[PDB]
């Protein structure tokens, strides 16, 4: 039996909201967000991880830095590489640069990753409730998303299969008193704390996989 609502931010699994600025690296922020929660689950220590390390070093795994990428390829790089540096030691500059991965500054590892069945929102609910934050892709290509402010986000022109933006599901919940009505996914974005609701968005949940939230979800195995 899964809980009626989950919010990993209230348990110390989530770093403050970051900002990718003018670089298509949301895939990297989604990936660091998920690894941050799994390393916290493992050691009890919350340590911000380096998106720039992923931008600069994971081209061999199929990512293209500020030109886009995929969270699964990022978890694959961390596995193959044997580590990932901290935000502090390998700072974010939002441009493609030379790979300067330093093993002595690594604060995270993974052995691969687990995938949630494509399009299965209840499989994603189970992953969120039992594992921690989950990396997901969504269709964020709309002005309504760009100017989102509060409430449950629902966009008619949203696609559940052609996705363009990586984010992190940190929980789920509902509004009102009926735990099965007007449900939503709690999602951390990487456009800074100033965007949306303190950097977060509530996306309609159990409404036919709105915006593709459960189409390509995964988490790193630590």
């Amino acid at each position: 039996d899964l809980p009626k609502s989950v919010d990993w931010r209230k348990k110390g699994y989530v770093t403050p909201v970051k900002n990718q600025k003018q670089c298509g690296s949301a895939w990297a922020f989604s990936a660091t967000g998920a690894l941050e929660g799994q390393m916290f689950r493992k050691t009890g220590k919350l340590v911000s991880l380096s998106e720039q390390n992923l931008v600069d070093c994971s081209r061999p795994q199929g990512n293209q830095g500020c030109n886009g990428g995929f969270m699964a390829r990022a978890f694959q790089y961390v596995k193959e590489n044997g580590g990932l540096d901290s935000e502090e030691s390998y700072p974010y500059v939002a441009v493609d640069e030379i790979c300067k991965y330093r093993p002595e500054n690594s604060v995270a590892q993974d052995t691969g990753f687990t995938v949630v069945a494509p399009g299965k929102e209840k499989a994603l609910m189970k992953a969120v409730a039992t594992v921690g934050p989950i990396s997901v892709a969504m269709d964020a290509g709309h002005s309504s998303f760009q100017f989102y402010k509060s409430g449950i986000y629902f966009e008619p022109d949203c696609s559940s299969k052609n996705l363009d933006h990586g984010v992190l599901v940190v929980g789920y919940g509902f509004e009102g008193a009926n735990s099965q009505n007007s449900k939503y996914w709690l999602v951390k974005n990487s456009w800074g704390p100033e965007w949306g609701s303190n950097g977060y968005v509530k996306i309609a949940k159990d409404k036919n996989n709105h915006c593709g939230i459960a189409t390509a979800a995964s988490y790193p195995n630590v």
């Binding site: 298509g24 690296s25 949301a26 895939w27 989604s30 990512n63 293209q64 030109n67 886009g68 990428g69 995929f70 969270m71 892709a137 996705l163 363009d164 933006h165 990586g166």
Partner: peptide, 4 residues
């Protein structure tokens, strides 16, 4: 060229 993927997610951005």
């Amino acid at each position: 060229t993927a997610h951005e």
